[PDB]
Scaffold this active site. Structure first.
Site, short mmCIF file in Angstrom:
data_model
loop_
_atom_site.label_atom_id
_atom_site.label_comp_id
_atom_site.label_asym_id
_atom_site.label_seq_id
_atom_site.Cartn_x
_atom_site.Cartn_y
_atom_site.Cartn_z
N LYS A 167 3.99 -3.94 6.94
CA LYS A 167 4.08 -4.23 5.51
C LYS A 167 5.35 -3.65 4.93
O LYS A 167 6.04 -4.32 4.14
CB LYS A 167 2.87 -3.65 4.78
CG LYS A 167 1.58 -4.46 4.92
CD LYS A 167 0.41 -3.79 4.12
CE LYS A 167 -0.77 -4.75 3.86
NZ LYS A 167 -0.38 -6.00 3.12
N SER A 200 0.79 -1.22 0.00
CA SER A 200 0.00 0.00 0.00
C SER A 200 0.83 1.28 0.00
O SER A 200 1.85 1.36 0.68
CB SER A 200 -0.87 0.01 1.26
OG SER A 200 -1.71 1.15 1.27
N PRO A 206 4.86 7.40 8.77
CA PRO A 206 4.50 6.69 10.01
C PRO A 206 3.26 7.16 10.79
O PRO A 206 2.67 6.35 11.54
CB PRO A 206 5.76 6.82 10.88
CG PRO A 206 6.63 7.80 10.20
CD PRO A 206 6.30 7.73 8.75
N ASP A 207 2.86 8.42 10.64
CA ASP A 207 1.63 8.87 11.33
C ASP A 207 0.34 8.66 10.52
O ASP A 207 -0.75 8.97 11.01
CB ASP A 207 1.73 10.33 11.83
CG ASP A 207 2.69 10.50 13.00
OD1 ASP A 207 3.93 10.56 12.77
OD2 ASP A 207 2.21 10.59 14.16
N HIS A 208 0.48 8.13 9.30
CA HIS A 208 -0.65 7.83 8.39
C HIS A 208 -1.86 7.26 9.13
O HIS A 208 -1.70 6.37 9.97
CB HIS A 208 -0.23 6.87 7.25
CG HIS A 208 -1.15 6.88 6.07
ND1 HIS A 208 -2.38 6.25 6.08
CD2 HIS A 208 -1.04 7.46 4.85
CE1 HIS A 208 -2.98 6.45 4.92
NE2 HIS A 208 -2.19 7.17 4.15
N1 LIG Z 1 -8.14 -1.99 0.40
C1 LIG Z 1 -7.47 -1.04 -0.28
O1 LIG Z 1 -8.10 0.01 -1.03
C2 LIG Z 1 -5.96 -1.12 -0.25
C3 LIG Z 1 -5.24 -0.02 -0.72
C4 LIG Z 1 -3.93 -0.16 -1.12
C5 LIG Z 1 -3.34 -1.41 -1.05
N2 LIG Z 1 -4.02 -2.50 -0.57
C6 LIG Z 1 -3.28 -3.76 -0.51
O2 LIG Z 1 -3.50 -4.51 -1.65
C7 LIG Z 1 -3.40 -5.89 -1.36
C8 LIG Z 1 -4.58 -6.61 -2.03
O3 LIG Z 1 -5.80 -6.08 -1.55
P1 LIG Z 1 -7.16 -6.91 -1.60
O4 LIG Z 1 -8.19 -6.09 -0.91
O5 LIG Z 1 -7.48 -7.35 -2.98
O6 LIG Z 1 -6.77 -8.16 -0.64
P2 LIG Z 1 -7.80 -8.96 0.35
O7 LIG Z 1 -9.06 -9.17 -0.32
O8 LIG Z 1 -8.06 -8.24 1.62
O9 LIG Z 1 -7.11 -10.39 0.62
C9 LIG Z 1 -6.03 -10.61 1.49
C10 LIG Z 1 -5.86 -12.13 1.45
O10 LIG Z 1 -4.94 -12.53 2.42
C11 LIG Z 1 -5.43 -13.70 3.04
N3 LIG Z 1 -4.88 -13.95 4.38
C12 LIG Z 1 -4.95 -13.15 5.50
N4 LIG Z 1 -4.32 -13.80 6.51
C13 LIG Z 1 -3.87 -14.98 6.05
C14 LIG Z 1 -3.19 -16.01 6.68
N5 LIG Z 1 -3.34 -16.13 8.01
N6 LIG Z 1 -2.87 -17.13 5.93
C15 LIG Z 1 -3.21 -17.24 4.58
N7 LIG Z 1 -3.92 -16.22 3.96
C16 LIG Z 1 -4.22 -15.11 4.70
C17 LIG Z 1 -6.92 -13.50 3.13
O11 LIG Z 1 -7.51 -14.76 3.26
P3 LIG Z 1 -9.10 -15.03 3.37
O12 LIG Z 1 -9.85 -15.11 2.06
O13 LIG Z 1 -9.17 -16.41 4.00
O14 LIG Z 1 -9.68 -13.89 4.19
C18 LIG Z 1 -7.18 -12.81 1.80
O15 LIG Z 1 -7.45 -13.78 0.83
C19 LIG Z 1 -3.29 -6.02 0.16
O16 LIG Z 1 -1.93 -6.20 0.55
C20 LIG Z 1 -3.69 -4.65 0.65
O17 LIG Z 1 -2.97 -4.29 1.80
C21 LIG Z 1 -5.33 -2.38 -0.17
#
Ligand SMILES: NC(=O)c1ccc[n+]([C@@H]2O[C@H](COP(=O)([O-])OP(=O)(O)OC[C@H]3O[C@@H](n4cnc5c(N)ncnc54)[C@H](OP(=O)(O)O)[C@@H]3O)[C@@H](O)[C@H]2O)c1
Length: 243
Positions: free
Chosen positions: A145, A123, A129-131
């Site tokens: 991360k 992300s 750090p204060d985000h």
């Molecule tokens: N949300 C945003 O707008 C935002 C913004 C910028 C970047 N991102 C980053 O982009 C990436 C992809 O985002 P996304 O929303 O498409 O991802 P996501 O749907 O939230 O999926 C994360 C995956 O990680 C799995 N997971 C979590 N803990 C685990 C563990 N204990 N063992 C095995 N699997 C595990 C989850 O499993 P389950 O299916 O079992 O839950 C899920 O399938 C992430 O790194 C996120 O931080 C997100």
């Protein structure tokens, strides 16, 4: 093999992860697809096929089977906040365990198996750090991360770190994708990106040497304010940062 890579995608039942998984299968000409998911429910959600493994990234031995014979790794796992409208992290499933340690375990597993290339999706927000995101469920998600990211840059394996903008559920292939350094895109109104273009960038990073040992922030232009990115050579070339 060198010329037909087995690519493991972890978080393959995730929203971005499952697009990565299908694109490795759709184009299962240039790649052999392999998925890692956390549960049997996740495995069935994505087709339940034989190339999908079940494991917990916080338990290194439970994920080791998935890493056998792989050539590349795409890390698409994340700690996910749960709501009780206030958000919390389940126990032993905080960003420290899932995003630092959970990723450390993937990276260590991958070095063993002799992976040529590890791609990680993270992300924007990590230079500050204060985000606000760090407060969510008291997790420090972006800090952990980033730790994983630095650990990956450090390990000696060729890497691509992709710090995405806000994730959108919108069509891929239809935007000009933007590549930044150090959260600079967060000053703009082009700091968000469809999940399907992040997935496309993971796959493209596999195909171009210009992606190895790079770290960039990923945004996009609204659909219609420019020509869609079709030329990923040029795109990766504009990155010079290693972290
Ligand atoms: N949300 C945003 O707008 C935002 C913004 C910028 C970047 N991102 C980053 O982009 C990436 C992809 O985002 P996304 O929303 O498409 O991802 P996501 O749907 O939230 O999926 C994360 C995956 O990680 C799995 N997971 C979590 N803990 C685990 C563990 N204990 N063992 C095995 N699997 C595990 C989850 O499993 P389950 O299916 O079992 O839950 C899920 O399938 C992430 O790194 C996120 O931080 C997100």
């Amino acid at each position: 093999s060198a010329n037909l890579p087995t690519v493991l995608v972890t978080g393959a039942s995730g929203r971005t992860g499952q697009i990565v998984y299908k694109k490795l299968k759709e184009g299962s000409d240039k790649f052999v697809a392999k998925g890692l998911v956390r549960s049997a429910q996740g495995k069935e959600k994505i087709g339940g096929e034989a190339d999908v493994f079940i494991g917990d990234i916080t338990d290194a031995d439970s994920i080791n089977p998935a890493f056998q014979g792989i050539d590349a790794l795409v890390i698409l796992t994340s700690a996910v906040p749960k709501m009780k409208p206030e958000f919390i992290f389940e126990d032993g499933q905080y960003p420290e365990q899932v995003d630092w340690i959970g990723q450390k375990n993937q990276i260590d597993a991958a070095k063993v198996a002799g992976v040529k290339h590890i791609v990680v999706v993270g992300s924007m927000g990590g230079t500050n750090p204060d985000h606000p995101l760090n407060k969510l469920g008291n997790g420090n998600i972006l800090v952990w991360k980033r730790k994983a990211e630095q650990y990956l840059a450090d390990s000696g394996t060729p890497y691509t770190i992709i710090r995405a903008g806000g994730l959108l559920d919108k069509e891929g292939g239809v935007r000009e994708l933007l590549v930044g350094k150090d959260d600079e895109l967060l000053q703009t109104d082009t700091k968000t990106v469809p999940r399907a273009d992040v997935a496309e960038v993971c796959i493209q990073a596999l195909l171009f040497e210009e992606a190895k040992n790079k770290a960039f922030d990923l945004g996009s232009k609204p659909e219609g304010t420019s020509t869609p990115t079709k030329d990923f050579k040029a795109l990766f070339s504009q990155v010079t940062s290693r972290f």
